[PDB]
Amino acid sequence: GLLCYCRKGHCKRGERVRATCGIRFLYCCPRR
What we know:
Elements: E1 5-8, E2 15-20, E3 25-30
Antiparallel strand pairs: 1-3, 2-3
PDB class: antimicrobial protein
Keywords: Cryptdin, antimicrobial protein
Assembly: monomeric
């Protein structure tokens, strides 16, 4: 599947916001 990270308040360059991960946490997944 795709790679995703649960980051605090931001997503890294290239990561799309897939969903919310927590209150202060975003669920970001690299475009590539």
